[PDB]
């Protein structure tokens, strides 16, 4: 409920606590309600620790546990420039491994939308926008019941939010090429009225019904757009509801052997009829040099969507025409496949799991995603250790079995995943009955072989 | 690092076939570290690939197979053929004819018919051809062409015809059959100092006949029928140049008619050959571990080195993959630009290797005599050894590919493994035209991969677009027009990609090649900010206006 | 990595001790005083604002706070990868319980005389450092009694329990290197931190033929000076008699002991060489097993073994670490018909260990396996191994 204590504060770590200004340490906070106020009163704890523990140890505080009102609250930290972001959420709704990834997504989103984390908070004009953002953030993390077959995504979110990737839909090549050509038709375009071009189209990506279909955009830019869309529920909106017209215009700061050119970037997102098309535009660079949408870029994405509406039924047939590989109520039950180098997950469709439904089924799905999060935490520790070595230069498999039963039938329920590193960093998750003696290499080969974005 | 993942099914019951424990990539039938064997039994039995064969009636599969195994070890096999993926026949010099049937990679039925043994008078059968209506037989020391006609489809009649060829006492007479059963050939590697070393044979109206004969200019490495205009007889003849160096002469006959010959120079004398299913690629194995491919359309001879002597080669029936096999059991995979591909047998850990060693398969002295993709998917490779085991190698060729392994699928895997240089060489081997649709999609996979991520990669983008813009051998205009719209769009994105980096001169040249209105202005505004180029771009813009 | 543990009296804010370790070795390094005062001052700041600080963690380290009663704050800093609050919380429960066993809740709670605690807690430092560093014990992490299976469990158990009345207590146990080989029903009804801490104290102390170390047992006797008497008969092998204040020291005389323990010499000697392993010699283990952690969840007792393979990959020190770390992961999935496994190492085979776990019949077995082990065969291997161990617990 909304009465459960949680808080966000942005604090300065120049701890001149003797000065006269009230709450000079707080540059921003949300919510304003009483449930947060006790957390606000203990703000001095975070300040003391964020100075002290990096003096004691070689690194920043990342998280902490407080108990308040009988709740265990996990509080995340980010000391960006002797200036601290802090987020506190109940452990009852938010596992620590979820929170640390959530703050990371918040940090990336703030930098993406505002250029830098510290300045985003130091700007007073960004306060009501921060309040709106955190209102949405503290509904997803704390009160999931709003949900913005039943609650399939909510059970999925336990795992789906943690992975470094985007839900994506595998297609037959006969469909894929119409979709890729439509993006190429947009990306090559330059239309006006002899004039300097307004923007370079850095790239674009297409989603349908919450699934990424294809992308001409770079992986790093796909990740940042997807995280933004999670926080604003744009993808689930397309998945559940028919959008008449959506238009979003934002200035963005997507990080961007010659050096990368100087410029400013704009994110345009337009969507109709469960499609959502994202375009990342560059000012400067090859192009002219903040403005609202220029209309012409909106017209080009809308035209692209009209072309894509000719194949939506073909995609729906792929969604409807039995699971691939097939699933049983062959004893495969579920999977998630991820190439970390590209913004791709491969998953059973909502339609395909609904087609697999039963009284046992929805419980099994929740168990799968929750176990996969517990697996991800182990892989993520490994990924960080390996990344540190990779940075200095310029663990492998996990699974569990749960016997489950509705004198009902008793079914084995393996949840397994594997991490590959050398030719690519890629992760696989699968679920199956113990009746089939599966090999992870055989499956990973079958799923990853021939795969392309 | 890209590889194909395979599983082997060994049909022999011999205990000499020392497959290692936990070698899950190889399965064997069993007759009627142990815990690892039991674990493999569990996998095999969770699977539909049984650890042991039925000894029960009527099939008596264990016993019928055991007799086949005895026949394989004690007699030379002159023929093996497939009618479909589950149907095979093989014939022995003993005169015993055997037919077997499969389910999946596993044996279901064995039938042994020994009744022909006492009816066919012969001396050393060297070869045979099999059809449902008839069998053609040939011998090492006779001018007898033995012809068997079945009243079934056993119950059969035996006829003999006289072979017109020379030196019947020692000459080895090879046979081949058209898919049209009305035409057959017989040939031999004649060396001498009445003249023919190839016969054209017909079949009609219940009778075998000799129609005509030729003498070839050189003694053949192979003789084969075409699939187009099927009566046409293709050959590959190894030869010696006036240079006193080896060459391959691809003579073609319509007999005395030699309609065409092509001479391909070799690093060393050819030892084997095969034709690609599109027939546009001839591949020869050669001495000193060399592999030579000639592309007729691109009219280019490609060379590659191999890690094994290529005594046996066979094209995958999709045409996308070549297998190279040593008689000693080494196997290597090549693409159609002769890049090596790594091979792995199924295992719990990922270990791609450039060759596969079948020397691990057995302690037997038996040598590999045949690799064959099974005739009408096609993920099964039949293997035969003389006086050795039979079995089939299964290729686990993707789920989303639905088991397919076209050139397009190899390209996608090379994109997944970032083997781009190799993917481009394949793209160059596509020859567009008839293959242009598959080539186009393969190009798109390469260009999108590179546009999403350095001058080395720019060179790869230039070349990939270059396979359409600057063909080694020109495209048909209707091919150009089919892809013209999409290729230009992929090039336009590349131009913009280049402009973002300070490499305007090459981008400028592409702007000239594309010639789009105002395209040059994209050089001008950047060069305007090398500043001299800005005025040049203004001039180029004026050349359209 | 290094570890620091600090303790303060909450009533005065005055530090009672600081302990540390480097590489698992005992260390003399202590935190800066102003840091120490700030670590507790921040905790007390939360106390006055109705907030209990319980943890913090930096990218390199995990820090845990606990408040016990109204009087003790324990703060632990551990600069090690894969460390979590569950392991640290159980460690602090063990440390606080150890403080309870040494002084009781009297003095330890409602603290007035800080100086007395500063002197009285010094004996605790030896045991605390033993907890901070590595040892071949898991009870401090599992809250299960560390245990060994003898070749003759019925012979040792009958003679052990037959002595309990003669010892003046219903609580008797037999210990090898901190592991319980056998114990009485009274001994087995000891509470979770209580049953673990007692053999830990015994194993961490220097050996004696007749120890008497006071234990204010937390379960029902937290203010009563119960005392622990132990008898070393062979190196790393000792008897423990858990006593109230009433049992005489005459109960430790050889004239009473010999008839209960001499007949047991053969199985007592048989358990001695086990060292790091918990299974009897010649037990029919699968050859891929590098070690086991066997829990009985209803009986709250567990076997810990590292098999003395000569391959040394991983080393025994690493194997102990791997089983301890795997357990911590198992308790985030299995702990409130199921199995768990890990595969460690780089892409090539022979690069790392397999780990497995299964829960069946209210016992749960953890497995450390050779790099050669098949990954599909793990469940049936786990099933057979449990069946072999089923009769033992």
Curated annotation (Swiss-Prot), chain A:
It is found in: Cytoplasm; Cell surface; Cytoplasm, Cytoskeleton, Cilium basal body; Cytoplasm, Cytoskeleton, Microtubule organizing center, Centrosome, Centriole. Coiled coil: none annotated. Changing residue 193 to A: In SRTD20; uncertain significance; impairs recruitment of IFT43 to the basal body, but no effect on subcellular location, when tested in a heterologous system; no effect on the assembly of the CPLANE complex. Belongs to the inturned family. It is linked to Short-rib thoracic dysplasia 20 with polydactyly: A form of short-rib thoracic dysplasia, a group of autosomal recessive ciliopathies that are characterized by a constricted thoracic cage, short ribs, shortened tubular bones, and a 'trident' appearance of the acetabular roof. Polydactyly is variably present. Non-skeletal involvement can include cleft lip/palate as well as anomalies of major organs such as the brain, eye, heart, kidneys, liver, pancreas, intestines, and genitalia. Component of the CPLANE (ciliogenesis and planar polarity effectors) complex, composed of INTU, FUZ and WDPCP. Interacts with CPLANE1. Interacts with NPHP4 and DAAM1; INTU is mediating the interaction between NPHP4 and DAAM1. Plays a key role in ciliogenesis and embryonic development. Regulator of cilia formation by controlling the organization of the apical actin cytoskeleton and the positioning of the basal bodies at the apical cell surface, which in turn is essential for the normal orientation of elongating ciliary microtubules. Plays a key role in definition of cell polarity via its role in ciliogenesis but not via conversion extension. Has an indirect effect on hedgehog signaling. This is Protein inturned. It comes from Homo sapiens. The lineage of its organism: Eukaryota, Metazoa, Chordata, Craniata, Vertebrata. The gene is INTU. The chain holds residues 302 to 942 of 942 of the full protein.
Swiss-Prot record, chain B:
The keyword Heme does not apply. The keyword Transmembrane does not apply. It is found in: Cell membrane; Cytoplasm, Cytoskeleton, Cilium axoneme; Cytoplasm, Cytoskeleton, Cilium basal body. GO terms for molecular function: phosphatidylinositol binding. GO terms for biological process: auditory receptor cell morphogenesis; camera-type eye development; cilium assembly; cilium organization; circulatory system development; digestive system development; embryonic digit morphogenesis; establishment of planar polarity. Keywords: Bardet-Biedl syndrome, Cell membrane, Cell projection, Ciliopathy, Cilium, Cilium biogenesis/degradation, Cytoplasm, Cytoskeleton, Disease variant, Intellectual disability, Membrane, Obesity, Repeat, WD repeat. One of its GO terms (cellular component) is axoneme. WD repeats lie at residues 256-304, 305-344. Changing residue 21 to N: In CHDTHP; impairs protein stability; no effect on the assembly of the CPLANE complex. Its main location: membrane. Belongs to the WD repeat fritz family. It is linked to Bardet-Biedl syndrome 15: A syndrome characterized by usually severe pigmentary retinopathy, early-onset obesity, polydactyly, hypogenitalism, renal malformation and intellectual disability. Secondary features include diabetes mellitus, hypertension and congenital heart disease. Bardet-Biedl syndrome inheritance is autosomal recessive, but three mutated alleles (two at one locus, and a third at a second locus) may be required for clinical manifestation of some forms of the disease. Component of the CPLANE (ciliogenesis and planar polarity effectors) complex, composed of INTU, FUZ and WDPCP. Interacts with CPLANE1. This is WD repeat-containing and planar cell polarity effector protein fritz homolog. It comes from Homo sapiens (Human). The gene is WDPCP. The chain holds residues 34 to 630 of 746 of the full protein.
Curated annotation (Swiss-Prot), chain C:
Its main location: cytoplasm. GO terms for cellular component: cilium; cytoplasm; cytoskeleton; extracellular exosome. One of its GO terms (molecular function) is phosphatidylinositol binding. It is found in: Cytoplasm; Cytoplasm, Cytoskeleton; Cytoplasm, Cytoskeleton, Cilium basal body. It holds the Pfam family Fuz_longin_3. GO terms for biological process: cilium assembly; embryonic body morphogenesis; embryonic skeletal system morphogenesis; establishment of planar polarity; hair follicle development; intraciliary transport; negative regulation of canonical Wnt signaling pathway; negative regulation of cell migration. Belongs to the fuzzy family. Component of the CPLANE (ciliogenesis and planar polarity effectors) complex, composed of INTU, FUZ and WDPCP. Interacts with CPLANE2. Interacts with CPLANE1. This is Protein fuzzy homolog. The lineage of its organism: Eukaryota, Metazoa, Chordata, Craniata, Vertebrata.
């Amino acid at each position: 409920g909304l009465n459960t204590p949680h808080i966000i504060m942005y604090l300065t770590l120049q701890l001149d606590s003797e000065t006269s200004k009230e709450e000079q340490e707080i540059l921003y906070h949300y919510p304003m309600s009483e449930a947060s106020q006790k957390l606000k009163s203990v703000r001095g704890i975070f300040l003391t620790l964020c100075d002290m523990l990096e003096n004691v140890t070689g690194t920043q505080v990342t998280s902490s546990s407080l108990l308040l009102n009988g709740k265990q609250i996990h509080v995340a930290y980010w000391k960006e420039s002797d200036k601290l972001l802090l987020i506190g959420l109940p452990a009852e709704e938010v596992p620590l491994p979820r929170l640390r990834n959530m703050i990371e997504n918040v940090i990336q989103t703030l930098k993406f939308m505002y250029g830098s984390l510290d300045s985003a908070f130091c700007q007073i004009e960004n306060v009501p926008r921060l309040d709106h953002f955190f209102n949405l953030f503290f509904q997803r993390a704390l009160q999931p019941a709003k949900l913005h077959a039943q609650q399939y995504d909510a059970s999925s979110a336990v795992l789906l939010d943690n992975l470094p990737g985007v839900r994506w839909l595998t297609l037959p090549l006969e469909i894929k090429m119409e979709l890729d050509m439509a993006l190429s038709d947009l990306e090559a375009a330059d239309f006006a009225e002899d004039m300097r071009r307004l923007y370079t189209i850095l790239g674009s990506s297409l989603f349908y019904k919450g699934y990424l279909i294809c992308s001409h955009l770079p992986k790093d830019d796909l990740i940042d757009i997807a995280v933004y869309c999670r926080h604003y529920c744009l993808l689930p909106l397309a998945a559940k509801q028919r959008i008449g017209q959506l238009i979003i215009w934002r200035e963005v700061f997507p990080q961007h052997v010659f050096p990368e050119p100087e410029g400013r970037y704009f994110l345009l997102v337009v969507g109709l009829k469960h499609y959502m098309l994202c375009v990342l535009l560059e000012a400067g660079g090859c192009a002219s040099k903040s403005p609202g949408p220029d209309c012409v870029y909106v017209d080009q994405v809308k035209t692209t969507l009209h072309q894509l509406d000719g194949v939506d039924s073909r995609i729906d047939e792929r969604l409807a025409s039995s699971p691939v590989p097939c699933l049983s109520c062959n004893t495969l039950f579920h999977y998630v496949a991820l190439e970390t180098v590209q913004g791709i997950f491969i998953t059973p469709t909502l339609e395909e799991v609904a087609q697999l439904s039963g009284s046992i089924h929805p419980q099994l799905i929740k168990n799968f995603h929750q176990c996969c999060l517990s697996i991800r935490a182990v892989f993520q520790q490994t990924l960080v250790e390996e990344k540190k070595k990779g940075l200095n230069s310029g663990v492998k498999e996990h699974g569990v079995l749960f016997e489950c039963s509705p004198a009902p039938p008793v079914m084995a329920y393996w949840v397994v995943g594997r991490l590959f590193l050398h030719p690519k960093p890629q992760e696989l998750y699968v679920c199956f009955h113990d009746s089939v003696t599966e090999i992870a290499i055989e499956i990973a080969f079958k799923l990853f072989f021939g795969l392309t974005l | 690092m890209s590889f194909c993942l395979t599983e082997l099914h060994l049909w022999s019951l011999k205990n000499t076939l020392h497959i290692a424990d936990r070698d899950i990539g190889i399965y064997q039938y069993y007759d009627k570290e142990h815990g690892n064997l039991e674990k493999k039994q569990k996998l095999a039995e969770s699977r539909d690939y049984p650890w042991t064969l039925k000894n029960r009636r009527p099939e008596k599969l264990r016993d019928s197979l055991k007799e086949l195994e005895e026949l394989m070890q004690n007699s030379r096999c002159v023929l093996s053929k497939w009618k479909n993926k589950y149907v095979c026949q093989l014939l022995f010099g003993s005169g015993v004819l055997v037919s077997l049937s499969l389910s999946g990679p596993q044996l279901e039925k064995v039938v042994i018919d020994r009744s022909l043994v006492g009816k066919l008078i012969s001396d050393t059968i060297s070869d045979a051809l099999l059809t449902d209506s008839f069998i053609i037989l040939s011998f090492l020391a006779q001018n007898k062409l033995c012809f068997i006609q079945f009243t079934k489809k056993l119950d059969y009649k035996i006829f003999y015809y006289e072979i017109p060829g020379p030196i019947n006492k020692t000459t080895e007479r090879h046979l081949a059959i058209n898919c049209v059963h009305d035409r057959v050939v017989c040939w031999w590697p004649l060396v001498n100092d009445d003249r023919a070393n190839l016969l054209l044979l017909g079949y009609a109206q219940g009778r075998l006949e000799v129609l005509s004969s030729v003498r070839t200019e050189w003694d053949p490495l192979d003789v084969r029928f075409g699939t187009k205009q099927p009566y046409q007889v293709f050959t590959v003849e190894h030869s010696v140049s006036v240079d006193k160096e080896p060459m391959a002469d691809s003579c073609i006959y319509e007999c005395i008619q030699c309609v065409s010959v092509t001479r391909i120079p070799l690093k060393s004398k050819a030892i084997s050959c095969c034709r690609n299913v599109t027939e546009d690629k001839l591949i020869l194995g050669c001495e000193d571990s060399s592999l030579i491919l000639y592309e007729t359309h691109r009219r280019v001879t490609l060379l590659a080195q191999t890690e094994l002597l290529p005594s046996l080669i066979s094209c995958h029936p999709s045409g996308a993959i070549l297998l190279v096999g040593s008689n000693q059991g080494e196997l290597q995979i090549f693409d159609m630009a002769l890049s090596p591909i790594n091979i792995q047998l199924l295992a719990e850990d990922r270990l791609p290797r450039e060759t596969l060693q079948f020397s691990k398969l057995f302690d037997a002295s038996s040598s590999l005599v045949q690799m064959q993709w099974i005739a009408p998917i096609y993920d099964l490779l039949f293997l035969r050894f003389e006086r050795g085991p039979l079995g089939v190698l299964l290729f686990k060729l993707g789920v989303f590919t639905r088991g397919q392994l076209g050139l397009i699928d190899i390209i996608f895997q090379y994109i997944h493994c970032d083997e781009i240089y190799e993917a481009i060489n394949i793209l160059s081997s596509m020859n567009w035209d008839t293959l242009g649709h598959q080539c186009f999609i393969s190009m798109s996979a390469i260009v999108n991969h590179l546009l999403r991520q350095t001058p080395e990669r720019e060179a790869q983008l230039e070349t990939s677009l270059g396979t359409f813009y600057a063909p080694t051998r020109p495209l048909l205009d209707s091919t150009i027009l089919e892809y013209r719209d999409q290729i230009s769009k992929y090039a336009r994105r590349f131009f913009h990609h280049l402009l973002r980096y300070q490499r305007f001169e090459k981008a400028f040249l592409l702007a000239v090649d594309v010639g789009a209105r105002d395209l040059f202005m994209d050089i001008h505004y950047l060069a305007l900010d090398e500043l001299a180029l800005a005025e040049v771009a203004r001039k180029r813009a004026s050349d359209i206006d | 990595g290094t570890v620091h543990l600090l303790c303060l009296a909450a009533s005065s804010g005055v530090p009672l001790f600081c302990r540390s370790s480097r590489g698992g070795a005992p260390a003399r390094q202590q935190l800066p005083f102003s840091v120490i005062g700030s670590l507790n001052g921040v905790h007390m700041f939360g106390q006055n604002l109705e907030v209990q600080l319980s943890s913090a963690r930096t990218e390199n380290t995990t820090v845990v706070w606990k408040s016990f009663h109204d009087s003790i704050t324990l703060i632990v800093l551990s600069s090690e990868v894969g460390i979590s609050e569950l392991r640290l919380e159980r460690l602090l429960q063990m440390v606080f319980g150890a403080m309870v066993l040494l002084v009781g809740l009297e003095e330890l709670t409602n603290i007035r005389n800080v100086e007395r605690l500063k002197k009285d807690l010094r004996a605790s430092y030896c045991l605390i450092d033993s907890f901070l560093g590595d040892s071949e014990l898991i009870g401090d992490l599992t809250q299960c009694v560390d245990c060994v299976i003898p070749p003759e469990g019925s012979l040792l158990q009958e003679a052990l329990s037959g002595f309990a009345e003669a010892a003046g207590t219903t609580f008797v146990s037999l210990v090898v290197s901190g592991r319980v080989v056998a114990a009485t029903e009274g001994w087995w009804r000891l509470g979770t931190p209580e049953a673990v801490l007692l053999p830990w104290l015994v194993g961490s102390l220097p050996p004696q033929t007749a120890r008497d170390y006071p234990v204010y047992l937390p379960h029902g006797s937290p203010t009563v000076p119960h005392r622990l008497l132990t008898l070393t008969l062979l190196p790393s092998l000792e008897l423990c008699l858990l006593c109230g204040p009433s049992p005489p020291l005459s109960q430790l005389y050889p004239q009473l002991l010999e008839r209960w323990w001499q007949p047991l010499l053969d199985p007592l000697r048989a358990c001695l060489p086990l060292g790091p392993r918990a299974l009897p010699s010649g037990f029919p283990l699968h050859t891929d097993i590098l070690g086991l952690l066997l829990l009985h969840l209803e009986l709250k007792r567990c076997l810990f073994t590292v098999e003395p393979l000569g391959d040394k990959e991983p080393s025994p020190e690493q194997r102990r670490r791997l089983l301890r770390n795997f357990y911590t992961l198992v308790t985030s999935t299995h702990f409130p018909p199921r199995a768990c496994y890990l595969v460690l190492g780089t892409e090539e085979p022979g690069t790392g260990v397999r780990l497995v776990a299964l829960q069946l019949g209210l016992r749960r077995l953890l497995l450390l396996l050779s790099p050669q082990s098949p990954t599909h065969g793990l469940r049936s291997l786990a099933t057979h191994t449990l069946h072999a161990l089923t009769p033992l617990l």
